[PDB]
Amino acid sequence: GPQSFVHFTKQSLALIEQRIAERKSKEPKPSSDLEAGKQLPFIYGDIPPGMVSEPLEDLDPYYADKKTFIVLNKGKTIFRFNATPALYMLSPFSPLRRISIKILVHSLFSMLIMCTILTNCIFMTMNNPPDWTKNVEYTFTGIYTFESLVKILARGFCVGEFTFLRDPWNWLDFVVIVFAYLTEFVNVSALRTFRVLRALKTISVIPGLKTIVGALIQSVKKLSDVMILTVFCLSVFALIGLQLFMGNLKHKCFRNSLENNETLESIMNTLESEEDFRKYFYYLEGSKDALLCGFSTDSGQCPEGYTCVKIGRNPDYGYTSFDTFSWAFLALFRLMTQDYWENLYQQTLRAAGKTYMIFFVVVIFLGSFYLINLILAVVAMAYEEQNQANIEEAKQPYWIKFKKCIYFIVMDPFVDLAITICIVLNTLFMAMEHHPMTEEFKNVLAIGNLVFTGIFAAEMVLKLIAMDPYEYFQVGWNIFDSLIVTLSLVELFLLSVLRSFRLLRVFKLAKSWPTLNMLIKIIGNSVGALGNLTLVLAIIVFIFAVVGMQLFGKSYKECVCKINDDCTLPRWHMNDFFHSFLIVFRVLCGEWIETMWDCMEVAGQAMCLIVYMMVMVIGNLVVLNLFLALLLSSFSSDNLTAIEEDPDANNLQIAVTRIKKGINYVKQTLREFILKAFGKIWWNIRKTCYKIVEHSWFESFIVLMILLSSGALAFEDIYIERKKTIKIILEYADKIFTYIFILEMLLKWIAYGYKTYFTNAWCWLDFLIVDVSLVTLVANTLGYSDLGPIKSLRTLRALRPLRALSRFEGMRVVVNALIGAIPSIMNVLLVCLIFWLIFSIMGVNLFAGKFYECINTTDGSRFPASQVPNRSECFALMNVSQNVRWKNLKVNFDNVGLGYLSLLQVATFKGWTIIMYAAVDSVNVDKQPKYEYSLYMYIYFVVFIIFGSFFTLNLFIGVIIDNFNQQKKKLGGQDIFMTEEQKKYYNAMKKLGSKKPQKPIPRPGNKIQGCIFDLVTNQAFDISIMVLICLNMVTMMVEKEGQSQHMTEVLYWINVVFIILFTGECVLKLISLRHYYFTVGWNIFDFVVVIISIVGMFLADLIETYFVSPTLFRVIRLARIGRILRLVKGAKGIRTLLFALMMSLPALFNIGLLLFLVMFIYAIFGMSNFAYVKKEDGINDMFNFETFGNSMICLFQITTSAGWDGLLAPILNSKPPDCDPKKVHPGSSVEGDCGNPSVGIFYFVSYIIISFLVVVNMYIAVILENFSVATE
Amino acid sequence: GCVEVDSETEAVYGMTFKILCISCKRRSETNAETFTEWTFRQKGTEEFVKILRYENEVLQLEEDERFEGRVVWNGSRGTKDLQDLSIFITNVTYNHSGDYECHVYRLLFFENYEHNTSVVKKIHIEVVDKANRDMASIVSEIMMYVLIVVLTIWLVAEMIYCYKKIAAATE
Amino acid sequence: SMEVTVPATLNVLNGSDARLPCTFNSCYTVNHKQFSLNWTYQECNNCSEEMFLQFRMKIINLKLERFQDRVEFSGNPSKYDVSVMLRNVQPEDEGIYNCYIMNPPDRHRGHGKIHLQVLM
Ligand SMILES: CC(C)CCC[C@@H](C)[C@H]1CC[C@H]2[C@@H]3CC=C4C[C@@H](OC(=O)CCC(=O)O)CC[C@]4(C)[C@H]3CC[C@]12C
Ligand SMILES: CC(C)CCC[C@@H](C)[C@H]1CC[C@H]2[C@@H]3CC=C4C[C@@H](OC(=O)CCC(=O)O)CC[C@]4(C)[C@H]3CC[C@]12C
Ligand SMILES: *[C@@H]1O[C@H](CO)[C@@H](O[C@@H]2O[C@H](CO)[C@@H](O)[C@H](O)[C@H]2NC(C)=O)[C@H](O)[C@H]1NC(C)=O
Ligand SMILES: CCCCN1CCCC[C@H]1C(=O)Nc1c(C)cccc1C
Ligand SMILES: *[C@@H]1O[C@H](CO)[C@@H](O)[C@H](O)[C@H]1NC(C)=O
Ligand SMILES: *[C@@H]1O[C@H](CO)[C@@H](O)[C@H](O)[C@H]1NC(C)=O
């Protein structure tokens, strides 16, 4: 009814009550379109002037029976209340009541409340409020009380159904008000902590945030199975780590010679200081922990006069250990999130041995990458439903001639192209800025910038006079360009930041570039269609920062000496709001463990653990939800573009079209003007050799030769001079393999012909490899073995393993997928380079030449700024004293390429902290840095992480997955990472998980076996067995380092009882289910598990009694984990995800084979190149490129990009005093101890890029495909 | 870094010979002050007489007609931490055949600790008139030609055999 | 300053044992070799401070003539307690009592002032 607007009166109330009385004496869902909070349908038409913001009768027929009255504001919103007397004191027709609804519905009230809350947040930012803030706090409390009391008068408190307390946000408001009033009357950090709950009212006040929060809650609700599986996997891996590395991190080197009849026990008591511990244990220079050692040959070694012993505390304040199940769980969660995991990796390898890297490989690949990809898949699928549900319901005079001439000048295919070329030239010109400059270069740069800004302003004015200002400010690009022109003129009239604002004109190229437009679509979607999610993220980050400050700032300030030897605040703390926000942002980037260590040292374990875990979970959830939301709103929309491609005929295309029209007009005239002015045996041999090459035996022999040659490559380490016989054997095997491969090439030449051989890319690769080998052999034979690039040509022997690429079909198909994705990968890489060029130029403008510093090289500590403020003083100290250096930062913003390297380090969060510390300490050029002098340069890095890391990563994943999907759909719907033979196994083993019905194990005829069979088949039996497995798990977790002798025996007997019970259950299952027990695969698993349990218990007893082998005893005892792996039986959520993992296993195997081949090639290259670099930063006595194992360990570490900056750092130095180009290296003829910066940078950047392209992308797309397959 | 490469056991009369003695530290970053002493026991002689001693960058040569002017330092240079204790013989004679002993005395320096270690390396020198060729290279060089010839024979045998089968189908 | 909980005014009857509580709060653990404790007594606001109790790696009392042997301790540094006793308080004992606390590595120095009043 368009005219259903009746005033609510006593007659209407009486009629409603009369109908209720009629209904009560005789003893559907509400319409969504008329529900409270949304807008009234347009079918009702305009509201009368006397009906708006007044008590009106209910419109929903469902609420017609009950006593509910409606009020509609001028904003066309449905507000529903209760007609019952509120608190039995005032009627709906009461005078003050009417004013209560009138002020409750006004949008001015909402604006006032929002302003009050924003001001309250701004004052919450302060950490040391002045004396006059008390009055403002009183004002805020009064405003909140007035706001809440208005709601109480209108809707009532609790008695009705549309009352105050029925809304949970009103619950939050009431709790806030009562907790604010309680404090002042009663009359510490916990008490002010509750003030953040005021900031949580922004969600209720600001429209649209409630729906976003609800959607986030549902997304959490859909992650139950993934969370349970993650907890189970972390617990299992933590049990394995506890069994393996218990107490290993307590290994220290204790001095052999002791005086005054002292012993280890005697000296351990009277040691409370760092220096006292240094006097008895070996410490590295400037290290907070004693050096770790091991008792194995592959472990760390103590200095002469020291012996390894298990004593003392664990590293990192004692927080890093596998001593208890809780610390092992923390370590495994740290591994899963890959936060500083390389430090734990190196510590565990040093303490236990290099052979234990298998544990880390398994945990990183099976646990870290896989669970993260599962989380991403589940969240993205949940968001896909949610979006599908959302769209589904939505679907349901003379100057006039002058400006005419200027308009003619505006003619686009030349002037617009000229302006585009000028923009490109300008951004190229500004990229030439660098720190070490001559005056003429600076002058020419300034002249060029002035000329470019003059040209741009002239084009602005020309357009402004061509077309009048009224519609000139219509195109967004036009107002944008006016903004840049005004900003450039303002900068010319008057900081460093202001100069780089003109770089945004590079974005003009998006009209022709289809991927830069994609990037702008992603960027603008964050503040557009997805603005509420970004607002929620910002509010959550602010709340976390304020909570951290209010909880830990005073603890940081007063417990400084526990986390700092200088008794001053560390780099990262929560004392003030800015640093607390920085800590929260760093946690969101994935770096939480070290700041958590500091927090736990200054403020206690429990509180910091709770706060950090809450921040991690909630912030990661919100950030990842925003990431997938952007990735799906910007990319999945490629289904229908109603508008044509660039309706203005693709303005740039006509420029190309017009130019080639002239080119064709010139080319045709140029040619015309010049013309006007002027046997059986051979084919038998071919067929026989064709028969030879494709024979299976020939292929197997060639594959074996390739493997043998690669293995021979893997032998030339720094210790090759210790083994002369192996060296000679390898030198002759090199010639043997060269002969074999030359023969193979000649045979393929005679058996394929030149055309087919040289139209094949694999044959071209093999041909190039054999040519480099032949040239090396010829040079070696003729004696030209050590002149020019012949060593570099010999270095290229590491490319020999590429011959195996064309002989394994899995690596071949993965390489084919890579090649298919190469074009879009290069396009998006170019787009990302263009985007990062702006940030690199800004970083050069900000931080050029400001990272130099006097350093006392004995300890590497920067001199204060009171003495030596500036460079002349550093040279004065150079003569005044010794060991003083004016040292740069290796990776800096001195030029655009170095800026690119610094931005790569910042984007990957590897080595970024050094750059940020240098940047926030920067003062000027040739000036000594001051501690956090330019403190707010952290904002530069925050903005770069937001734009050049978050958005560029979004674009990378979107485009790469789009290319993979296009490749998959081109083939017809088959996996692009599995071989042809692998597909049959995939189909069969996918059908293995779908057979629902089976014969129900017919009961035995006799009595006792039936009477225990029905006990077997009872579900209570299975529940009891599951409970017993959980109890056995718990008894495994209760173990800890140095527990007791009584505890050890008690736990041993408990485990024996558990083993006996499980074996009895298995046997009693065998008395029944006669020979039918072995039909079910899970029953076979249980039988095998109890077999290993019994065998391992007996073997451990035998080893502990009759043998001596602690390591092998621990490995054998690791077999009892199989008992708790049976917990998967009674879990459908875990079984489905593990089935998806087994689905993805073959493609993962192929990808891992390719990754291992690449790692092998890079290991040989690293052994060839960086085997003699200085042992500093990430390269030490244990993690280097000296042997094959060390290089493999380092490359596995940096496959996740962890610590690649530390490995690259000593290779960057190439001149004295940073290295010694004439080092002796006893036992070898090599001289020099520093590497090639170009080769090292290319090596590490290429390896990390290849790892990102392979492991991350592929793991995700194969996990995603298999998750989609298994979720049906 | 540092690799303990063993010394060659064969010297050639008239030529120059270098006797390797490399004693690397357990940890490469530790500070040490090392000096070495060499003792030589000629064949047919019992006692290990001393021949030379190197300390503080100066080589002190004892009295020995067998080594009067035919020994120069061939170890670490410009440092007190000597991980290379090798010596050089500028003119090999039949009297240089015997057993050499390379005593290394390393004094480690730590925070409040000073450790005095000792390493002894034994080297056997046999002076010969003509440089014998190592048996490792003899077998390996022969094994090259054996494998090269056998593999070529294996390939040619199949190539010739396959011609008979293929040509038969043509006819 | 450091969190030092000090009663503002203490009144005790003459001729009875008087417990004088002085306590503090800080980070870190109490170190005997580092703990430094000042115990000063003044007869008025402008009167000169007089040291009577001390803590140099142990409990050291100077046995002041004006206090004789009536000064005793009931605190242990572990529980952050440095309270002192005056057995058989006298009207002369009326004045100002102060306890400075120095607990390294904390560079701040505590300060707790008590004005003791003796009733008739
Ligand atoms: C992102 C959305 C879901 C909002 C998240 C808000 C939380 C970050 C806030 C809301 C209420 C806060 C709590 C309010 C009160 C307390 C009690 C407070 O108690 C103490 O400090 C007492 C112990 C001591 O410190 O001595 C510790 C912080 C804590 C748990 C706060 C932790 C942070 C919480 C959970
Ligand atoms: C920004 C500064 C540092 C200069 C960088 C080099 C530019 C001169 C190059 C780099 C990438 C080039 C672009 C790469 C791809 C395209 C898309 C091309 O159009 C299409 O491919 C259309 C495809 C379709 O419509 O489906 C038009 C040229 C353009 C914008 C190119 C214009 C010239 C660009 C911007
Ligand atoms: C470099 O550092 C010094 C440190 O003060 C700057 O100041 C001069 O220092 C010298 C030596 O201490 C004094 O004798 C001069 O009097 C100082 N200058 C002034 C203005 O008093 C010095 O100016 C700095 N150099 C540059 C070029 O900035
Ligand atoms: C539409 C189904 C894909 C669902 N899902 C898979 C997991 C990651 C996010 C999302 C996805 O891949 N989107 C997507 C699309 C849609 C096209 C091209 C590139 C990308 C990344
Ligand atoms: C053993 O210790 C005592 C001091 O307790 C010391 O006097 C004595 O000399 C020591 N004897 C030995 C064996 O060093
Ligand atoms: C007691 O008094 C002195 C001042 O005389 C004060 O510095 C310190 O707190 C105490 N003594 C020392 C030297 O610690």
Residue numbers in the entry:
A (entry chain A): 8 to 34, 47 to 206, 210 to 418, 728 to 825, 831 to 1014, 1175 to 1768
B (entry chain B): 20 to 190
C (entry chain C): 29 to 148
Task: Show sentences the authors wrote.
Voltage-gated sodium (Nav) channels govern membrane excitability in neurons and muscles. Nav1.7, encoded by SCN9A and primarily localized to the dorsal root ganglion neurons, has been explored as a prominent target for pain management. The S1-S4 segments in each repeat constitute the flanking voltage-sensing domain (VSD), and the S5-S6 segments enclose the PD that is responsible for selective and gated ion permeation. Here we report high-resolution cryo-EM structures of human Nav1.7 treated with drugs and lead compounds with representative chemical backbones at resolutions of 2.6-3.2 Å.
Therefore, BPV, LCM, and CBZ occupy the same site beneath the intracellular gate, which we name as site BIG. Instead of wedging through the gate, these densities block it from the intracellular side. BPV is primarily surrounded by hydrophobic residues, including Leu964, Leu967, Leu968, and Phe971 from S6II, Ile1457 from S6III, and Ile1756 and Leu1760 from S6IV. The 3,5-dimethylphenyl and the piperidine rings of BPV, linked by an amide group, align on a similar plane against the BIG site, leaving the butyl tail pointing to the cytoplasmic side. The purchased BPV is a racemate of dextro-(R)- and levo-(S)-bupivacaine. The aromatic ring and the piperidine basic nitrogen of these two isomers largely overlap in site BIG. The primary difference in the binding poses of the isomers is the opposite orientations of the butyl tail. Therefore, both racemic isomers of BPV can be recognized at site BIG. In the presence of the drugs BPV, LCM, or CBZ, the three S6 segments other than S6I all slightly move toward the center in addition to the α→π transition of S6IV. Consequently, four gating residues, Leu398, Leu964, Ile1457, and Ile1756, move closer to tighten the gate.
